[PDB]
């Protein structure tokens with residue numbers, strides 16, 4: 001864990017060379033188009049973000065501090081409807097189990113029956129509590145555990161052939177809100193997305209997700225851009241970030257524009273049968289990214305050619321020509 005970094009104000013966040021090397025670059029081709037890009041979430045590539053189900057990285061302590069700030073200002077970024085309480089406990093079990101197994105230097109879990117002892121050595125937490133008993137923890141169980149894991153989470157109720165957004169912790173969203181989307185179904189909350197509905201992407205995706213079983217979780221990547229390493233790009237806070245989209249110049253693209261990638265996990269929760277949706281968010285400035293000349297050239301092509309409805313949905317319109325002009329420098333054929 002490096003020294004404490006900010007994702008707001010002075011934006012001190014930066015990636016080490018190792019974090020650059022493992023950044024989940026999301027473009028298999030020189031152009032991007034939506035698809036059902038799901039794969040089984042099996043361990044691969046030691047040291048990569050795909051090695052464990054939940055990835056903890058050099059930014060862990062910084063990110064937890066950011067989460068704590070968001071929640072101090074707005075506790076309503078976490079919601080669990082009452083029928084989702086068991087699912088919240090399943091989520092806590094899943095995270096503590098995997099984190100203790102995969103990062104034993106940082107986390108420990110010892111259990112006898114419902115008498116659980118969790119230690120997070122990274123954050124200095126030593127908690128004896130009763131699994132299932134919310135009066136035994138300092139806050140509601142989803143909140144408790146997600147205050148200790150990177151990325152956002154949604155917990156979906158599976159009923160009546162569909163998935164409903166009935167719980168979550170959403171403090172680093174790509175410009176959407178849990179309080180807006182609470183209780184919506186799968187196709188409903190995706191209503192703003194261009195193109196993909198007419199393509200069938202959302203019909204096919206719902207079908208795959210409804211069939212996910214215990215022990216066979218699934219993953220995909222999503223991406224966007226963000227100006228500065230701002231994690232909290234929420235509707236709730238738009239006045240704090242939306243104007244920065246007007247601040248990009250030819251000389252500062254490398255410092256301001258960041259590639260944002262979501263490594264998404266979809267995993268069946270064993271007691272409740274709910275689906276856990278992990279949204280693990282990675283950020284990299286374009287100065288850091290263009291250290292890899294293959295990334296740089298591919299990014300130029302993608303951004304130059306991106307369909308306009310998709311660029312507008314993603315929020316890149318305002319600075320796109322500047323960005324494309326800057327990236328052309330790393331594409332010899334261009």
Ligand code: HEM
Nearest residue numbers: 034035036037154156176189190192193196205223224277
């Ligand atoms: C339960 C699982 C999922 C949840 C909770 C979720 C949630 C969301 C949310 C809230 C948005 C933002 C919509 C907005 O602008 O207000 C979004 C966008 C998106 N979702 Fe999902 N989603 C899930 C699964 C999937 C899967 C499996 C796909 C497969 C393709 C998918 C494809 C997309 C696409 C293409 C967008 C637009 C993103 C962009 O252009 O950057 N989603 N999703």
Ligand code: NA
Nearest residue numbers: 029033034035
């Ligand atoms: Na293809």
